[PDB]
Amino acid sequence: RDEPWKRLPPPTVYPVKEARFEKYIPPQLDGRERALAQPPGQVAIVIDNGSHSVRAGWNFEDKPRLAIPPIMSKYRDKTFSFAGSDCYAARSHIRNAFEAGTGIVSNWDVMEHVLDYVFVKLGMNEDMPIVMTEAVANLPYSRKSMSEIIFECYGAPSLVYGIDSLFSFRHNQGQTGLVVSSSYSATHVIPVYNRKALLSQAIRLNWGGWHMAEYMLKLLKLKYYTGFPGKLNSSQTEHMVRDFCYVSLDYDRELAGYLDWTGLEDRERIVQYPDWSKSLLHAFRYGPRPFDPSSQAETHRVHLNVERIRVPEVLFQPAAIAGVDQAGLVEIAGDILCQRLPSLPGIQDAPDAFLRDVFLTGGNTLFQNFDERLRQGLMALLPVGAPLRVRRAQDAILDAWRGAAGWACTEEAKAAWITREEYLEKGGEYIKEHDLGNAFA
Amino acid sequence: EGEVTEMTPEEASTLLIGLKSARGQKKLRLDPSIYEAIQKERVQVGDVIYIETNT
Amino acid sequence: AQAAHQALVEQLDLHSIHKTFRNPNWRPNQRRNKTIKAILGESQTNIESAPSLAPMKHYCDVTGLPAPYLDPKTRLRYHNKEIFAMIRNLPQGMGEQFLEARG
Ligand SMILES: Nc1ncnc2c1ncn2[C@@H]1O[C@H](COP(=O)(O)OP(=O)(O)OP(=O)(O)O)[C@@H](O)[C@H]1O
Secondary structure, three states, X not given: OOHHHOOOOOOOOEOOOOOOOOOOOOOOOOOHHXXXXXXXOOOOEEEEOOOOOEEEEEOOOOOOOEEEOOOEOOEEOOEEOOEHHHOOOOXXXXXXXXXXXXXXXXXXXXXXXXXXXXXXXXXXXXXXXXXXXXXXXXXXXXXXXXXXXXXXXXXOOEEEEEEXXXXXXXXOOOOOEEEEEEOOOXXXXXXXXXXXXXXXXXXXXXXXHHHHHHHHHHHHHHHOOOOOOOOOOHHHHHHHXXXXXXXXXXXXXXXXXXXXXXXXXXXXXXXOOOOOOOOHHHHHHOOOOOOOOOOHHHHOOEEEOOHHHHHHHOOOOHHHHOOOOOOOHHHHHHHXXXXXXHHOOOOOOOHXXXXXXXXXXXXXXXXOOOHHHHHHHHHHHOEOOOXXXXXXXXXXXXXXXXXXXXXXXXXXXHOOOEEHHHHHHHOOOOOOOOOOOOOOO | OEEEEEEEEOOOXXXXXXXXXXXXXXXXXXXXXOHHHHOOOOOOOOOEEOOOOOO | OOHHXXXXXXXXXXXXXXXXXXXXXXXXXXXXXXXXXHHHHHOOOOOOOOOXXXXXXXXXXXXXXXXXXXXXXXXXXXXXXXXXXXXXXXXXXXXXXXXXXXO
């Protein structure tokens, strides 16, 4: 039988998008000239301290000026010590400011040079207030060390810490809801009641986009079993996940009939690099086309069938696919909506208020059919008749900066700064209790 | 139609049953004689059941 | 030929630009750059992660298809007899890597 691969069309193949450099060195000095023209009290520098991409800019604009990874690299043959996106990922002594797998800064010799690159490329030749983001329920030593680097090393009037997902909440003009934000390091669920975060009962799932990339790397390492002639970086698997993964709607029916021969040519996604018809393992590794004859542009290919719907499914079934012994996103949301919020005194309506606006914030959210899966899960859990309306933010990876941009120069922010003499008197671990920041101690 | 969510005896008698569907669960208060028809059947935790309300 | 690459390495640098705002009086401490275990040992928040207790649908760990039964020798979920054959003749040092990818 020659039929199953005679009328089969030629393949449409996608190359590798590895996170390389980009030819830009701007010494942008046109922001300080506009910043010194505004009246005082309404000028502040906002830095989103993201784990995948630290962003920085001025508050009176809409787009951030700098958006770099925390990558630095220092070496010598004269000593080069450049950082940020200027590293090419051809010499790599790369160590990151964030600990791998958790958005808590514990590599301060890298974070100092990253902030140094930020203040150089913004233009500092001489004292502006600083609004800076952090992670939920941050460790006190990290906040103490960050405040020590802000005051003692550089010299700043004031800085204030906040949670970036709650800033994207405050920019999206919500009042009371359930912010579910899937970040690069962890996926948070935070209930907000009248512009105030209830951080005593927020729950973080320990999965994220970095875990997506690392688990995708492990499954491409174990799929291509006999040795694949190619460098399997983590970042190129991350760019595979970014454009070749979608959360399936009904998972147990889509999965079991996914590797059937009839129609596998349109499910399969193929990636370049610079008998058999009975077994499914040839369909799993290679596809409905015949075997590899060990050619030039045939061995250097990665085929993706199940990894499209298996890797972004770990957010919903964590204990079975990847063995993280925690709960799914739907089950965490149901645990908060149905079992904790009706049992908390001080609030009026637990189903009639928190279900009015459940929106999705973080960067690890822009998958096809992700809000619909969460809506069907919450529809299966909640009582009949609840006005459930799950939506997402407008600029999901950039609203975390814009929310702290709009917040930076208001009266509540002015009543929550920490000046230099307050750092000299109260100590290091001093917390102005704002409704977005963590609990005071 | 639907899956039993809980089997909670209220009084000490009336026993609430939450019937979870794929569209939403729903509370249901049972007579103390229809519960002795549920209980003769072997319904324990998460068995899907089919309760006629009238008959 | 490599002069353009040398100029790109030279202009992308931090020590080439003088630090006009860094305080030279500050001195870094050695006892930094710790882990989460060390910081949690210092303070003995971040214990709001919650596990689950529910029946899990166990899938295959060779392929991604749903698999209903495991093995005694290597304890791998597997779909059918082709995957059982590839499990029982795989080279050593990888049957533990499947459980390492699973956990
Ligand atoms: N178009 C897209 N489709 C799917 N995923 C995307 C897309 N664009 C970005 N992402 C994902 O978003 C993630 C980056 O998220 P982001 O940088 O906003 O997190 P973060 O704010 O740094 O997290 P944290 O607040 O914990 O530091 C990456 O893992 C990437 O995979």
